[model samples]
Target: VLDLGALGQDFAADPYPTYARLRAEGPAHRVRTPEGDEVWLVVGYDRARAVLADPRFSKDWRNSTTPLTEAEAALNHNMLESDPPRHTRLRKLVAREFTMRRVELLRPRVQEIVDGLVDAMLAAPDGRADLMESLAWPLPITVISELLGVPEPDRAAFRVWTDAFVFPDDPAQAQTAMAEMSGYLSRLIDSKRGQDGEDLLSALVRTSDEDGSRLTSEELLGMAHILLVAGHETTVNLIANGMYALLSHPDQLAALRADMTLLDGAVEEMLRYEGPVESATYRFPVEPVDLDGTVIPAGDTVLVVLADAHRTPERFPDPHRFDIRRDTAGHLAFGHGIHFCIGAPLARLEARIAVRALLERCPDLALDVSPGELVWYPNPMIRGLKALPIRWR
Candidate 1:
């Protein structure tokens, strides 16, 4: 067992080396979180994928007696906490509204948003700006809000509520933020009842199967809440993380700037290299299972550390090195199989446009702050720089 107290700080700063060592030693190992919870950390790419995609690992905790944190328990109401039939139903219902074609249709609109944000960023004196606040965060927030039919004025409030829930230092604060967000979403759903509009929220509200099955009010609110949060949070990190990687690796940055056609693959490599999500959402074993001679008890929680998995050299040769042209299509940045991210296309589109635009507009971009001065969130789930300061001539 690794001493998490000492390892936690190191993992927070840069986890790949530790992950590599762990993977080399074994497949499943025990680690105690600072919160004092003992959980199994699944490290290798293939093993991590197996654990996440296995039906023996339940996402729902209602059936289990395992203890849960406020944030973990609160996730039970959404698709993240569902299993099999229920999971399938909820995912399908929302999937109907988030088809690739539908997401792709927003490309022109996304490009417009990207161009607008880039223009605003360039307008700043000396071409220096906090890209996260000015471009990355707002672009997705705006797109998701517009897609959900959320009012223009309410976007800022939504951001605050989301940040509170995702990053709350206190359990009470996290719970309250979650409750407020759910309540707000409930009210929004009520307002849209019997209404028609050209947005995902409206489409979901009005959608029904040939048998006339429709989502209940609670379900509608749940879906809206998930979309709103996932849409912005994941993509925001994609832009921020991708920018950080490119700026830190000047050769990759220069190669992309010299050849704009490489933007799509570069973004894919970034996802593989420094994915925003550090681990898969909580997954618990349904039965005692043995993997590579290590037995995991039936009820213990297991997290597929995607960040660690992506950096395993056995999975991707020379994985720690970030190369824009690598074949990174199989990376688990979006997870795999049944629980893959629904907003992936949209996230990729937004990142592609944002990254390409940033490079095209500011070829000389460099980090204004030293790498040591950067700050990362304490929450291990999301991996990103809190604020990225950059300058360009």
Candidate 2:
């Protein structure tokens, strides 16, 4: 087995090279994560994309050979962790509320939020600040919380629970955070009962109230959990990671700065270069499946490495280079198949707006910390920097 832990911090900081080596060797390999979980790691663009769309690889945690704790299993009931019929129903219900039109309508409001955050940063007495605190962290969380109808006062607590649960420095803390978040969300859903409100959570509550068959209580809880967590969580990384990429690449940054229209493609490259998620959520084969000759035994855990797939030289010529003008159409940063990110449009819109506005407003924007100083979060599933320091006068 390829012991990822042996590679250590270097792998965590930048996994592409190791992944590339593995991809060159084969399409799949049995690997052990730094956290000590043993699973099948699928590399290369074609193989990874195929596995994502293959139904033999089940998304349901119950099907896995490795079992999870009760709290963990409860969180996996959302669409992201289910198969058809159940997944279809869950996505249908959520799609009704989280429509692209609904997201498009929020552009003006999103810009307003972006402008306000930039204003706060500009108002700071010191020219240097942690972008995570100033913009990246606040922007997505604020947008998602407001959309979900979370009370202003409760957001601080919500943020704590999400951070602890998503990237817990301690496993016990994550369990506690999960339990707390579940209880808090259940109570929030209860409060929305019989209330007519414009927010997404209230609307979801209304759906559940109208018909139990369409959305069961457990499903409602799971939906809220996933929406709240997945909504802001990934977007935070998208903004921060994308900005980090642009700042590090002077030519790419200058290209975008010179032509504002490259903003869309630049954001795409950001996702392709260093998307929020490192790998798709865990999948287990219903039966033994062969991926380019590597057999993943039935019920074994499978991790489709999106980070590796995006960098495979076979698919993306000179894949290591970050070019805003390159064709990034088939990138799996947002995932592939039906499990593709539901919040993708919102994320793209947010990134485009935030990047453009920041560049335009802060012409002096630059990284405060050197490349070696930036630390990526240790979470296995997600990939993002801990804090991005920036200076702008």
Candidate 3:
């Protein structure tokens, strides 16, 4: 047995080598967090899929009898925290506006946003820019803000709320950010009442009326909070990480630039090879469940290491290698089964537009800073550069 305490550290810094060893040694291993809480880490492709798909593995943290302090419990209350019936209901409520059809219609506009950002980058005298702030972060934020009917002025404030909510190192700060975000959404929800608009929040109100039941003020607030924070953060990472991959592999970038049809597969491979979110939010076993070789008893915490599973050799041959054309449909980057990300189509569209436009406009693009000099976010859940400084003649 590996010392899970150190393993957790290793997993966070660079999980591949450790994950490979675990995949060879055992699929399910006992692990402890720095907090010393014992848990199960599902390490292999098949085993991890079984763990996520099995209905016995509930998403409800409340079902667990394990001791959780008040703050921890609050952290668990988001959409990722509930099991089916409730999960189905909550998802449907948000799905009303997050449908692919709605996202599809926004494609041209999304491209326009991408073009505008690239234009701004090109206009700079240095021909250099921080892609994260210039393109990756702002594009999705603006798109989602418009889709959700957030007024233009409020977007900057919402951005701050999203950053604090996602990257808060202190539990108290996270709670405060969540509370403030919830309050902001509640106001937005109220504004939509007795009114109709082109944006998603208003559309959601219309859908609720058609269904003969409206989202409670709390539910509306929660759904909005989930949409704003989860939606943009993941896309930010996708753009940054995907660009990082393409820049590192000039051959692959050349291949993509030559044929735009490879984009769908390229995005899938990006999700599999260096996915934005490193792990699923959290899930708890409802009963003692045997996985691979280990038996996780009831009320135990389970974490699906998405990045680890994607690179398992059993699932993808020479899994460490990045193949832009690989069929990565089963990749867990957007997750699997019912809990799969609803915003996936939107994120893919945004990334596809962003990458294609960048290549078309600046084929000679190169990193302005050394790879080692790039800063990474401290959060384990999000994998993205703090700043991707780049330039091209």
Candidate 4:
């Protein structure tokens, strides 16, 4: 396998060029990830959509090329790791609690939170502040923590744990964090016993399917694991990246500020332009998938390169233009098929609120540092900036 991480931090820093190179080479390539793991990256928008919807490409970890401990398997056993009827059943359970109505109802609260964050950011003595710390990270974290009834005191601790939950710069860090986090989930589930409220954690604690099927103890931990991490990570990057892209493209920024109605479509454009996730989590082939050109061998790991797909010129006109008015109907920022992100509605709502609120609050909002000087995470799992310093009236 070609060592992807060995390509140096620069490639991890700006993977678009490497993705462009890979897309030109072929539909797929077997390359090593930053963690020194091998997986075939499905390049281009078409291949990504095809591989994602194909049942042959199973999301179950039991098909992984490597072994997994019981705890690892159990802890990771949420809907993301299963196929139907298990996946169908599990998704239904989460969807019930994480409904569009629930998110829509929270919009007023979301705007309130954004206004509060913006007020704090503007109050900086220096008249400039890192937007990531001030707004992007806190807005979604606060909302999710509140919805889950995670005490304000525990919010900071969860941030550190989720950071460790991702593909950390040192993969070993994730391994250690996983064990600790898994134990924490058990405590959370236990603590919720007999507790009743509208918070998602409590709803999840009380919910079950029409059939006798209910969340297994491990499944409870797994659901909470994916919900808390994937839930906020995608949104943080959306808000931060949406702002970064707008600031980088002055014309786009000016146009958006000129009209507030564009906020809805602008959020979609943000997903296509610089989405939060680098790729969907690893999916493996249960059996050889025979295509016109070749067969992806059974049991091989397949990663749908969401970042590359979002940038494909074949599907998008002037794919790099960052235009908010362009058609983004087919974009794969949230992936496609049965495994599409369930939290997508929530992410969009959060980003829309943040973008609109920031522009309304700070008419002169602009980047404080040169674009090239920005810092990006070393890990490839989540595509986002470390901090975004901004200044405004």
Write out the backbone clash pairs for model 4. Answer: none
Q: What is the C-alpha lDDT profile of model 2 across 1-393, one tens digit per residue?
A: 988768877888988888888888998899887665787888888999999989899988777878878778767768888889799999998685556787898889889999999998887677888888888888888888888888888878877987885667766787888888888888899888877888888988887888978888888888888888886778888889988899999998998988999998888899888888888888999999877688888899988899988887777788988999888988998888888888888888888999988899986899988989988876557888889988886
**Which candidate do you rate higher for lDDT, 1 or 2?**
2
Across residues 206-266, which tens digit of lDDT does each residue of candidate 1 receive?
A: 7531123455555566667777886577788889988889999988888887788888799
List all candidate RMSDs to the true structure.
Answer: 2.4, 1.4, 2.9, 2.0
Tell me the number of clashing residue pairs for each predicted model: 0, 0, 0, 0
Residue 158 lDDT, candidate 4, scale 0-100: 71
Stretches of candidate 4 exceeding 4 Å from the true structure: 167-169, 208-212, 291-294
Pick by lDDT: 2 or 3, better one: 2
In candidate 4, how many clashes are counted? 0
Q: Compute the lDDT of residue 369 as modeled in candidate 4.
A: 88
| Candidate with better TM-score, 1 vs 2 | 2
- What is the lDDT of every predicted structure here? 0.78, 0.85, 0.75, 0.80
lDDT of 3 by residue, 186-240 (tens): 6777788788686778876666556634454445555666777787888988998
> Residue 52 error for model 2, in Å?
0.7
Q: Which candidate would rank higher by lDDT, 1 or 4?
A: 4
TM-score of each: 0.93, 0.96, 0.89, 0.95
lDDT of 4 by residue, 1-393 (tens): 567778776876678888899888778788887777777888788888888888888888777676777557867778888887788877877686556787798888888888988887778777788888988999989888787667787788777767875556576767777777687766776677676666777777775322235776667677878887777878898888888999989888999888888889999999898888888778888888765454678788888888888888888968888999989899888878888889887888888888888898886799988867887665556788888989885
The TM-score measured for candidate 1 stands at: 0.93
Q: Which candidate, 3 or 4, would have the higher lDDT against the true structure?
A: 4
